[PDB]
Amino acid sequence: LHPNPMYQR
Amino acid sequence: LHPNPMYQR
Amino acid sequence: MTEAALVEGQVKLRKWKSRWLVLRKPSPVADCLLMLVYKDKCERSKGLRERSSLTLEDICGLEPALPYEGLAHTLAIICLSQAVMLGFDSHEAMCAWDTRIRYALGEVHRFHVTVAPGTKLESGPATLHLCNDILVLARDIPPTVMGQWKLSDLRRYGAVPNGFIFEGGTRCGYWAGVFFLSSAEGEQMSFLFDCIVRGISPTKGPF
Amino acid sequence: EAALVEGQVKLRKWKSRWLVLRKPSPVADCLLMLVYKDKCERSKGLRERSSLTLEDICGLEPALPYEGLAHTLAIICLSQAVMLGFDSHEAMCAWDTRIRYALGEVHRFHVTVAPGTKLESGPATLHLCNDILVLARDIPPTVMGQWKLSDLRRYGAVPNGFIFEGGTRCGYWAGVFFLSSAEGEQMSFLFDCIVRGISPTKGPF
């Protein structure tokens, strides 16, 4: 499953 | 002058 | 100068009542739709002030060809609050409206899915809607919203054999956790997800 | 990870940093700022040094002298103004041109506000930004008055100026307002298009 670049913020 | 159609909404 | 429309034509509204309907975005960067209803095309031709107006400001998705109140060529404008049912005669006019409205609203896609049992979500057939920055699951006729997430609040997601998995994080209180859907379009769903969260429209490139 | 624009820009002392600008939503009035250390830490794939989002954008003001720099662009919000420092007038124009189009309908008009209303008299700049209208002053710009376009009763071009009246809904900003300008007829046409769902350039929304 792909992590979400938006989520880290 | 120009009346606004958006106004009464 | 006449008020523009993204689409206009003869449509049934809610018994059913036939009236000339004008749909347009209230602003150039709107998630909303302004509904402008006239009695007939002439009242609109003669550019008189509409009989009624309404602004749908919480649209979650579109879904055509659901049977409802004796009609088969209907379009649903799905909202967080309510669904708005449009009534068309011809199949192609309904599709024309669905295709035109979709593009105009930005990135609005739908996938027929089956929600797996085990979670807070009701299981069974449903339709997953991506509406720009929001993800929604919708059921029944008229469609009601049974699950909602900001895409930016999803930790993880991905395509799997005959399905698609996504996880909502802490940001989404009681919608947090891992959810499982059956569909043959998981690769399409994941790629759509990959594009949006990085600001790419699969079709238009960067926003 | 895509950008509507990126390049070497100074931000606030001035810190020159590879800036990435993009919309978070395909149809929303927001800019996501991605601050990278350089072009390397960006063209490679590393996560940004810092990020910020601006969600109340109401206009753009280029070509401003600010804190030592000749060529600075102001992104104006209801809450604050973000200043961007460039080296050449062209590099900054590029950024102004690209952002304005991307955000939909964002327009600026250098006007003179007439005394008599709650507004302050003198040179200012009217900004139209999709839904909203704004008067801004100074460097850095501050908003000195705001209206939803839907909340306007009347507007029109007049010999060498422009007029718009705000409805009661506006509260403190209700009433008739007068502006001196040579772009009045251009202003009237823009308002005409927008309140009717027409982009002068793109056609129907």
Curated annotation (Swiss-Prot), chains A, B:
Let me know which tissues express this protein, per UniProt: Expressed preferentially in skeletal muscle.
According to its UniProt record, how is this protein modified after translation?
Answer: Ubiquitinated by PDZRN3. Ubiquitination promotes endocytosis and lysosomal degradation.
Provide the protein's localization: Postsynaptic cell membrane
Phosphotyrosine modification, residue list: 7
Q: What happens when the gene is disrupted?
A: Mice die perinatally being unable to take a breath and to respond to tail or leg pinch. Despite the presence of apparently normal skeletal muscle, the absence of differentiated nerve terminals is sufficient to account for this phenotype. Every aspect of NMJ formation examined is absent in these mice. Branches of the main intramuscular nerve do not establish normal contacts with the muscle, do not form correctly positioned or specialized nerve terminals, and are apparently not given appropriate signals to stop their wandering aimlessly across the muscle.
Q: What does this protein do?
A: Receptor tyrosine kinase which plays a central role in the formation and the maintenance of the neuromuscular junction (NMJ), the synapse between the motor neuron and the skeletal muscle. Recruitment of AGRIN by LRP4 to the MUSK signaling complex induces phosphorylation and activation of MUSK, the kinase of the complex.
The Swiss-Prot or TrEMBL record describes its family as follows:
Belongs to the protein kinase superfamily. Tyr protein kinase family.
Q: How does it assemble?
A: Monomer. Homodimer. Interacts with LRP4; the heterodimer forms an AGRIN receptor complex that binds AGRIN resulting in activation of MUSK. Forms a heterotetramer composed of 2 DOK7 and 2 MUSK molecules which facilitates MUSK trans-autophosphorylation on tyrosine residue and activation. Interacts (via cytoplasmic part) with DOK7 (via IRS-type PTB domain); requires MUSK phosphorylation. Interacts with DVL1 (via DEP domain); the interaction is direct and mediates the formation of a DVL1, MUSK and PAK1 ternary complex involved in AChR clustering.
* Name used for this protein in its record: Muscle, skeletal receptor tyrosine-protein kinase
From what organism does this protein derive?
Mus musculus (Mouse)
Full-protein residues shown = 547 to 555 of 868
UniProtKB/Swiss-Prot annotation, chain D:
Per the record, the domain of life is Eukaryota
Where does it reside? Cell membrane; Synapse
Query: What outcome is documented for mutating residue 169 to A in this protein?
Result: Abolishes interaction with MUSK and function
In what residue span(s) does the PH domain sit?
2-104
Domain IRS-type PTB: residue ranges: 100-205
Phenotype upon gene inactivation: Mice are immobile at birth and die shortly thereafter. They do not form neither acetylcholine receptor clusters nor neuromuscular synapses.
Q: Which comment does the entry carry about domains?
A: The PH domain mediated binding to phospholipids with phosphoinositol headgroups. Affinity is highest for phosphatidyl 3,4,5-trisphosphate, followed by phosphatidylinositol 3,4-bisphosphate and phosphatidylinositol 4,5-bisphosphate.
Query: What's this protein's function?
Result: Probable muscle-intrinsic activator of MUSK that plays an essential role in neuromuscular synaptogenesis. Acts in aneural activation of MUSK and subsequent acetylcholine receptor (AchR) clustering in myotubes. Induces autophosphorylation of MUSK.
Subunit and partners: Homodimer. Forms a heterotetramer composed of 2 DOK7 and 2 MUSK molecules which facilitates MUSK trans-autophosphorylation on tyrosine residue and activation. Interacts (via IRS-type PTB domain) with MUSK (via cytoplasmic part); requires MUSK phosphorylation.
- Protein name (database record): Protein Dok-7
Protein's organism: Mus musculus
Gene designation: Dok7
